[PDB]
RNA sequence: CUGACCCGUCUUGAAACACGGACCAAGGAGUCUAUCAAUUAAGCGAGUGAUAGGGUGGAAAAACCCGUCCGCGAAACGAAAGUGAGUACAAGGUGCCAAGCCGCAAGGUAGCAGCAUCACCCGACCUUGAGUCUCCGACGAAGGGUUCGAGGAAGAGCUUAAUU
RNA sequence: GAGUAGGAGGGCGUGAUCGUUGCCUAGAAGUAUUGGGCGUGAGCCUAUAUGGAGCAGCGAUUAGUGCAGAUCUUGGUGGUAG
């Protein structure tokens, strides 16, 4: 008998989600990056693996405007890789020359990036280009969603700015003085 | 990078009974052993006198 | 391919038979009866089929890649050789087609066992024709 | 009916169960309890300080003044 | 074509690194085994040195009518006498800090207002004492185990002592024993290196576990006496 | 469906994970049916997750007709995104005449400025404009035209 | 030889002098419809998706094509009248901090997502105003808040299935 | 390496549907077993006897899917008892 927490069987939450997707291709891409991860001591690949094993919802959108906004002098020559789907921002007027690598390009994002003199890359290609991730730029998109506003603090606790779940927005809906 | 094969162990053995283990940990042992014999083999005449 | 096909057919293959959670295959080219990338002849490149004929002749079937050609050599599944030397011939053929150590061992197994098998079969067919006559 | 009125027995242990959570030390703290006088001062002294990088149109406003 | 060739090259490269490493290592190990021997010998010499020193100081004293007090033990050993169930949470945690998490667990600790005060709470659940260097050695040879990247690894080779503690200047079991007994510059890592000792049933019965060693019981410091206990358990 | 559901894994455990003490019972346990006792024993619920549920707000509309209140909004940033690329480029190079964008045909009525505009000139035909919409339109080298 | 009270149940407490059970077969109890949410896999993405219905089609109620509207998202704040993410060339600062690039190492450079904070912005409520005109009501250069919001600030949604 | 209430992960067994591989008047299902074995366990395979027409595996789809109890339903039977 020993007094160890969780009996030394403590589960490790520090790990990479085992993905259940069914596109045979994700599983394969993943075989690839498992290789690159154990046999390459490059953080970049390990990173790619963690983020490609993401919850369907945990993959977040990259927009052309997002890329454009994050660009340094060196960011421009560098391969841009998002772990996610890349999409067009209709409100981006001129589109730079880009070599981008994502999982998925909205056909609009593709058309505009290509017709601007750009190149679209897939991770099997990226592997071949720079396994160490040399001169590569890994884009982590910003995280927004509606769910987030119902979370946080509860709706009507002191200083709660969180949103209530309501079936309609009207003067009559949870917009009237509560029972105070 | 090239593939390494996994870590190796040797099941614990008890130095106190098993010599080779003692020696692999502390070769000085062998010396202190032999001395202990030779120093003990010190003759009975020498013992008597020293007493 | 052998990778994509593995993932695709690993579970639903029509050559599949299970025993106590051990998956075996009916594949004619299986180098091991068991269902594994390697066991599965219709998937990867190395697979062999062997049939007896004309008293020593082994029909060797060399799993061959999917082919769009000018002439059709044999079944799309594979290539078909009649070998009259059989055992020795096929042993060579194997040595050529299976470079790695294990695959060699296995194919060869398929051979030894195959042959002695075909011998017994012969004996029995003999006794059978001599049974029909006498 | 009869009941046990108030016992604090299991509650202490319950509280120590997952540890006592302590908040995060954040470099920058909220402004509650700080008077407006001082606050306006901060606002002004920040707006006018060049060694503090503002937004573009902001610097336009600051440099015009 | 090219693939196979590049591999073959890999092979040659490999046999190469293997030879380089083989001879370099060999040299290194000759150096080592020598080191080990020199060290062990010298160390033992230093022990006997100090012990004798004590003897004679005592003698001059006795003759003067004056007395000579040897420096006070800087290393103690504690073994867990009592089970897990039904213990004040503080006590539990104090035990955890002393790294005795089960029954018949021995460990080494420094002697500090810090450490000594942290033992006030566990006194009735444990015996501590001042071990002889001999005892220490015996423990580390019979009960020796090492904490390796989390694993519990039998102390057999010295390669291990070099692996984790090598850079501190601990190459050998004997060295370990030395920083332990001296309590030198790195005690801490020398210790953590050492897996908590899982002991045996004492051959002598314990006396009374409800009682302090002072009452003929077992709980407390048996100052010098801890050794006897260790002897019974080894 | 069915073989995924809890029941299957609950068969033989006797309480169906409803508890031995508190078992699965009728409305009394629900705390009364539906929105029952929201104001009483359910106070905490209502207050906490639907604060402002009970009460009245300002002005009754006896018959509310939405159709005439109908006013889709557009922002400056999406303007050029409405008309094709052909257009804005061809009049970037050509300064002879300037582009007319009818927000109307796109199904929008009021134009609000949100982002900023290319320096290339435009005319925008809309039902309403915001002070800033007009600001940025004019400053760009562009013009605002009122439609019905 | 050693060990061995009757199960199910409610109970702090069941072998109980608590209740049900003489025996056996077959039957026998968290479903179905709708609703919102969280998570998981799918598709497409500033969009997404139809329904109704049209048009074809297997023997057949399938399937396959079309489907100007509609839903939901894309703008918010106001009871409301109403206004609308205010210097065209903007899309910030700071503290924590990941990749890439340097470096044997120590550390250096950079700063994606998130968290905290300060700043700006739209609207509610206050406060202030030269001047302008279709001058009696609107417009607006300049200048603000101890405050309010299920909001801006390089859009993250929409449809499908499943579980709770 | 304890565990009621409770939760999670894997697995056993039953209909029917779309597939895939097959078995049966040279004897299917069902039934009895002090025949032989396989699983820690749901359960399984075989043998013999009976039986005399349908069955079975594997991947999915779906569920009126697993009973010792509810003074539970219907039916059949005991001891009391010649
Ligand atoms: Mg144990
Ligand atoms: Mg409203
Ligand atoms: Mg707590
Ligand atoms: Mg005793
Ligand atoms: Mg006691
Ligand atoms: Mg479940
Ligand atoms: Mg349970
Ligand atoms: Mg008995
Ligand atoms: Mg009974
Ligand atoms: Mg009684
Ligand atoms: Mg009752
Ligand atoms: Mg239809
Ligand atoms: Mg809407
Ligand atoms: Mg910022
Ligand atoms: Mg049925
Ligand atoms: Mg018959
Ligand atoms: Mg089965
Ligand atoms: Mg018969
Ligand atoms: Mg099934
Ligand atoms: Mg039944
Ligand atoms: Mg029954
Ligand atoms: Mg009767």
Swiss-Prot record, chain A:
List the subcellular locations.
Answer: Cytoplasm
Q: Do you know which InterPro entries this protein is assigned to?
A: Ribosomal_eL18, Ribosomal_uL15/eL18, Ribosomal_uL15/eL18_sf
Q: Which GO terms describe its cellular component?
A: cytosolic large ribosomal subunit
Q: Which residue stretches does the UniProt record annotate as biased composition, category Basic and acidic residues?
A: 168-180
- Keyword Nucleus, does the record have it? no
Could you give a GO molecular-function term held by this entry? Answer: structural constituent of ribosome
- Biological process (GO) annotations? translation
Q: What is its main location?
A: cytoplasm
Q: Annotated region Disordered: where?
A: 151-180
Asked if Ribonucleoprotein is a keyword of the record, the answer is: yes
An example of a Pfam family matching this protein is: Ribosomal_L18
Q: Which UniProt keywords apply?
A: Cytoplasm, Ribonucleoprotein, Ribosomal protein
Q: Which residues form a coiled coil?
A: none
Family the entry assigns: Belongs to the eukaryotic ribosomal protein eL18 family.
PANTHER family under this entry?
60S RIBOSOMAL PROTEIN L18, LARGE RIBOSOMAL SUBUNIT PROTEIN EL18
Q: What is this protein called?
A: Large ribosomal subunit protein eL18
The gene behind this protein is RPL18
From Swiss-Prot, chain B:
Q: List each coiled-coil range.
A: none
Compartments (UniProt record): Cytoplasm
Which portion of the entire protein is included? 309 to 359 of 410
- Family as reported in the entry's similarity comment: Belongs to the universal ribosomal protein uL4 family.
Gene giving rise to this polypeptide: RPL4
The protein's name in its UniProt record: Large ribosomal subunit protein uL4
From Swiss-Prot, chain E:
Q: Where is this region: Disordered?
A: 1-32
- Please give a single GO biological process term from the UniProt record: maturation of LSU-rRNA from tricistronic rRNA transcript (SSU-rRNA, 5.8S rRNA, LSU-rRNA)
**InterPro entries to which the protein is assigned, alphabetical:** Ribo_uL30_ferredoxin-like_sf (IPR036919), Ribosomal_uL30 (IPR039699), Ribosomal_uL30_euk (IPR005998), Ribosomal_uL30_euk_arc (IPR035808), Ribosomal_uL30_ferredoxin-like (IPR016082), Ribosomal_uL30_N_euk (IPR012988)
* GO MF entry, a single one: structural constituent of ribosome
Origin superkingdom: Eukaryota
UniProt lists compositionally biased (Basic and acidic residues) regions at 4-23
Q: Which UniProt keywords apply?
A: Ribonucleoprotein, Ribosomal protein, RNA-binding
GO terms under cellular component: cytosolic large ribosomal subunit
The record, for Pfam families, names: Ribosomal_L30, Ribosomal_L30_N
In which family does this protein belong, per the annotation? Belongs to the universal ribosomal protein uL30 family.
Q: Which NCBIfam families match?
A: uL30_euk
Return the protein name.
Large ribosomal subunit protein uL30
**Biological source species:** Tetrahymena thermophila
Curated annotation (Swiss-Prot), chain F:
Q: In which organism is this protein found? A: Tetrahymena thermophila
- UniProt KW Ribonucleoprotein keyword: yes
- InterPro entries given for it? Rbsml_uL15_N, Ribosomal_uL15, Ribosomal_uL15/eL18, Ribosomal_uL15/eL18_sf, Ribosomal_uL15_CS
Sorted keywords for this record are: Ribonucleoprotein, Ribosomal protein
A Gene Ontology MF term for this entry? structural constituent of ribosome
Region: Disordered, residue numbers? 1-37
Q: Where are the transmembrane segments?
A: none
Biological process terms from the Gene Ontology for this record are: translation
CC terms in the record's Gene Ontology section: cytosolic large ribosomal subunit
Gene3D superfamilies (alphabetical): 3.100.10.10, 4.10.990.10
Gene that codes for this?
A: RPL27A
Q: Which residues form the signal peptide?
A: none
Q: What is the name attached to this protein's record?
A: Large ribosomal subunit protein uL15
Pfam families in alphabetical order: Ribosomal_L27A
Composition bias type Basic residues, residue spans: 1-28
Spell out the family assignment given in the record's similarity comment.
Answer: Belongs to the universal ribosomal protein uL15 family.
> What is the recorded phenotype of mutating residue 39 to K/E?
Confers cycloheximide resistance
